[PDB]
Ligand binder design. Structure first.
Ligand SMILES: [Zn+2]
Ligand SMILES: [Zn+2]
Length: 601
């Protein structure tokens, strides 16, 4: 175990002050906030734990209120004594997911500064795909030490105790060990992080500074109109009933909208070709092929889609409105993607259909408060611009340089015809190629997306590579370093480790290769987006203008800008994003505004 002998439980000021004194002279120290909820904005601080060095940690319980809880330093007293240390930018702190702790202290008017090391981000930058980056996994992985699990002290299910109900000493064991272990983890990882300037730069200048900005974005939240969302729900229910009647009307009898069961016995039994359509999917969708002529597969397609959308955003979103703010606070994950892109949950902003009407109606529900407007700043096809840069292709670079539509320019070159005359089919073909390249898509895969025969796709690809040599070179040079060094990195040095690069297995290695070509571009976009956030947030914090960065989805940053400041701010956001980030990639930021996210979008 870990007993009560390990860490002191600070129950008096004198001892707290003694610790604060020791904390002031420690080179770095790890600390944790303990609370009664995961919901940052409404969580209450139950106590704090600090680690001055390995083995020396303490828990200061401030709000444990179970039956007969012993006297504790009051939260306010503890916080006013601790405040100076926490706010001192010179006092360097280490923590596991400091984003969370920074937010909790903010609930008390304390501005956590000195957010120097986050063991979570250390782990993530060391090797994003090494496994899970939570304390329990880290402690075991790096220290062969199994930390006291939260469940161990709190329990499970509905009857799980909140921290304030847990006995002082038990709470002590958990909090102090966590603080202790975080410090040890940092001590093991920090040295490693310096063995390579790449990862080091990323962690230092990209990940770490992003911590307080993510906290700020999450705590600000986004205004969602529940009324609009409910109307949408109602309408969707009517559309589902209607589409369902239309389904039955096209065939005979009633049936679920489930393939490999009901649809095949109808569709192919009424003429068509036997294979169904898996919902794999983004390569062979038999249902939408038939849709250009066959009516039934067309309605089943739209029905399921609307069904998915309704339950996920229409029915859920209103439930996510925080009673304390009356806003939705999405949870961004800084250490989850293999590439380094921020992901999002509750809600997963990225799964809201972009090119679809219903998705648009969802975005319409993301509204600007009175006298404010939504401002969307998007990096126009940044990944394609990155690829142009990475491949040093003058063709692509020039296309972007002279503001031409690369998909049309690509088509103009691949199919050899004037830019003004490239047709939508050709532009769409060049587009399938362009984006196919980012994901390292095989010629056969491109054919499946373009509905053209194999080798016809290959014909297009050979013609591309001939007209755009740099891209092939890039692809080859990337697959090359991938095998030689087992990893690929972004312009900022962010690394993605490809263990199955020499897999000796087929598809597993193939995957590693697609990842090899893709990650540098996707990862670089991530890096850029993160630097834009830091840059923008810095201006926000310094100049204090009437604007809130409320979202980050894909390559766009979304704000709430005061209507009277829109222009000045629009200019400023724009310059910050396409000028105060990397200066090597030809970047373009499309800024838009409107009454809601869909409008600015
Ligand atoms: Zn993008
Ligand atoms: Zn510009």
């Amino acid at each position: 175990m870990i007993s009560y002998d390990n860490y002191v439980t600070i129950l008096d000021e004198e001892t707290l002050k003694a610790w604060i004194a020791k904390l002031e002279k420690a080179p770095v120290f790890a600390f944790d906030t303990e609370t009664d909820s995961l919901d940052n904005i409404s969580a209450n601080l139950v106590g704090l734990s600090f680690a001055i060095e390995p083995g020396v940690a303490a828990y200061i319980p401030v709000a444990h209120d179970y039956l007969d809880a012993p006297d504790q330093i009051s939260r306010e007293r503890a916080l006013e004594l601790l405040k100076p240390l926490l706010e001192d930018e010179k006092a360097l702190k280490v923590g596991q997911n400091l984003k969370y702790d920074r937010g909790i202290l903010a609930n008390y008017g304390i501005e956590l500064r000195g957010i120097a090391f986050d063991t979570m981000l250390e782990s993530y930058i060391l090797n994003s795909v090494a496994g899970r980056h939570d304390m329990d996994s880290l402690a075991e992985r790096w220290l062969k030490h199994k930390t006291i699990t939260f469940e161990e002290i709190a329990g499970k299910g509905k009857n799980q105790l909140t921290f304030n109900q847990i006995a002082l000493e038990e709470a002590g064991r958990y909090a102090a060990e966590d603080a202790d272990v975080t410090l040890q983890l940092h001590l093991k990882m920090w040295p490693d992080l310096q063995k390579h300037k790449g990862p080091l730069n990323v962690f230092e200048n990209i990940e770490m500074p992003l911590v307080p900005v993510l906290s700020r974005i999450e705590r600000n939240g986004v205004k969602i109109d529940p009324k609009v969302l409910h109307n949408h729900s109602e309408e969707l229910t009517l559309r589902l009933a209607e589409l369902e009647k239309k389904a039955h009307e096209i065939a005979g009898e009633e049936f679920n909208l489930s393939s490999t069961k009901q649809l095949q016995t109808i569709l192919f039994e009424k003429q068509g070709i036997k294979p169904l359509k898996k919902t794999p999917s983004t390569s062979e969708e038999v249902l939408e092929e038939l849709a250009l002529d066959y009516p039934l597969p067309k309605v089943i397609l739209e029905y399921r889609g609307l069904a998915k959308l309704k339950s996920t955003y229409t029915d859920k979103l209103p439930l996510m409105i925080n009673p304390k703010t009356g806003r939705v606070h999405t949870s961004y994950h800084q250490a989850v993607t293999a590439t380094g892109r921020l992901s999002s949950t509750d809600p997963n902003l990225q799964n809201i259909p972009v090119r679809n009407e219903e998705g648009r109606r969802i975005r319409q529900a993301f509204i600007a408060p009175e006298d404010y407007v939504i401002v969307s700043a998007d990096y126009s096809q940044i990944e394609l611009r990155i690829m142009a840069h990475l491949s040093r292709d003058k063709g692509l670079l020039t296309a972007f340089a002279e503001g031409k539509d690369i998909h049309r320019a690509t088509a103009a070159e691949v199919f050899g015809l004037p830019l003004e005359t490239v047709t939508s089919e050709q532009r769409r073909s060049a587009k399938a190629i362009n984006f196919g390249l980012i994901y390292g898509m095989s010629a056969f895969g491109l054919a499946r997306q373009l509905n053209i025969p194999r080798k016809e796709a290959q014909k297009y690809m050979d013609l591309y590579f001939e007209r755009y040599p740099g891209v092939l070179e890039y692809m080859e040079r990337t697959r090359a370093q991938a095998k030689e060094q087992g990893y690929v990195e972004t312009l900022d040095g962010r690394r993605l480790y490809l263990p199955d690069i020499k897999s000796s297995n087929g598809a597993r290695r193939a995957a590693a290769e697609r990842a090899a070509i893709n990650a540098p571009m996707q990862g670089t976009a991530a890096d850029i987006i993160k630097r834009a956030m830091i840059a923008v947030d810095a201006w926000l914090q310094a100049e204090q203008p009437r604007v809130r960065m409320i979202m980050q989805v894909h390559d766009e940053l979304v704000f709430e800008v005061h209507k009277d400041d829109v222009d000045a701010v629009a200019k400023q956001i724009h310059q910050l994003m396409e000028n105060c980030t990397r200066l090597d990639v030809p970047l373009l930021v499309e800024v838009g505004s409107g009454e809601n996210w869909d409008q600015a979008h």
